[PDB]
Amino acid sequence: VASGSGEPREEAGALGPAWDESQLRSYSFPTRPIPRLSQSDPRAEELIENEEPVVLTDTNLVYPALKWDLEYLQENIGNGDFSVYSASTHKFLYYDEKKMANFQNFKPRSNREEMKFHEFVEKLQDIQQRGGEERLYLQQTLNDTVGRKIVMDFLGFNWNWINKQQGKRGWGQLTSNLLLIGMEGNVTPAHYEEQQNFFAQIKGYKRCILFPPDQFECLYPYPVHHPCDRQSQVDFDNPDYERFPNFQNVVGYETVVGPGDVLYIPMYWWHHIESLLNGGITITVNFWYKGAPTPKRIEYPLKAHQKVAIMRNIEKMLGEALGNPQEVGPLLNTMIKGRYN
């Protein structure tokens, strides 16, 4: 019951296992599977209602994007600019650029490079043609600049289903759809979002490991003013148990998504996302929504995400009040040592 993603699934038409376990990276912690359910299944509505993750196998959320692949996209996506992240390791740590002002003892290991889609397909082409070690990850918000066919594709997504979802959950407005295109083996390490997320897998296979918000103590997010806010400081490949002792208690929910699957990633759930090894390129489109309004007014006992939201707001104000985010830590220490520990 520390199973993981379970035995792989059998493709339709006897096409053999979609993937196998040697495509999965190995970690220090155990996992239990996220349930794969039909969208008509009351249990799946239960999970989303309760803000627990679920993999919906038949939404058709992005049915028209299933034909997408690089040739189609290059052909049809337009000449807009695309954010492409670079890296020498498999782990793409994200940096918030606005936050980089107030941390100088920071340098990147992943640079954003703006480029046209064909330049991406191309940069992508040079690297394989020469066996390079390097890696790229395109991640760009879909918007109005995109070509006529992609727009027809987009309009054909299952808005009726996801709008009913937005409605039933009291969510706010859709903030963005991000288009993600990755190389095999790319990892987006563990982090959380403040939005609700339907994560709609289009091409290839991604393993998604989620941790609930009550595992905050085991995952050690960066300081809120740090550029890696909301990301774990823990290197999942080489965990430093002396700095991060509660990582030894972390327990995850795990699944592998393929073409057609939608993974509900609930607000504040940590997620770690890796494109299978030797699985080829992956494509995904996500759907971020604001999140229902905080109830006027509060009921106890608070949920884990609400305690998180509180920690963030304390860090933020202290940032403002002290005039400088760098003084947040010494102040907090002074506040607890010999007082609350």
* Residue 301 touches its own copies, criterion: CB under 8 A: yes
Dist. CA 232–CA 285, nearest whole Å: 23
Specify the residue, 218 or 273, whose C-beta has the smaller distance to Fe ion: 273
Burial 160-190 (b: 16+ CB within 10 A, else e): ebbeebbeeeebeebeebbbbbbbbbbbbbb
Dist. CA 320–CA 208, nearest whole Å: 36
Torsion from C-alpha of 116, 122, 123, 129, nearest 10 degrees: 170
Q: Measured from the CB of residue 210, what is the shortest distance to its own copies in angstroms?
A: 20
- Cβ proximity of 275 and 189 under 8 Å: no
Subset of residues 303 to 322 that bind its own copies, contact rule: CB under 8 A: 307, 310-311, 314-315, 317-318, 321-322
* Residue 255 touches ligand AKG, criterion: CB under 6 A: no
| 331 touches, from Fe ion, ligand AKG, its own copies, none (C-beta below 5 to 8 Å by class) | its own copies
Q: Measured from the CB of residue 192, what is the shortest distance to ligand AKG in angstroms?
A: 9
- Cβ proximity of 8 and 35 under 8 Å: no
* Residue 41 touches ligand AKG, criterion: CB under 6 A: no
How many residues bind its own copies (CB under 8 A)? The answer is 38
Subset of residues 180 to 199 that bind ligand AKG, contact rule: CB under 6 A: 180, 188, 193, 197, 199
Q: Measured from the CB of residue 230, what is the shortest distance to Fe ion in angstroms?
A: 9
CA-based nearest residue to 38, from 339, 260, 234, 232: 260
Q: Measured from the CB of residue 191, what is the shortest distance to Fe ion in angstroms?
A: 6
Query: Cα-flanking dihedrals φ and ψ of residue 141, to 5°?
Result: -60, 120
DSSP-derived pairing of the beta strands 206-211 and 252-257: antiparallel
* Residue 220 touches ligand AKG, criterion: CB under 6 A: no
Q: Interface with its own copies by CB under 8 A: which residues? A: 216-217, 220-223, 233, 243-246, 298, 300-302, 307, 310-311, 314-315, 317-318, 321-323, 328-329, 331-341
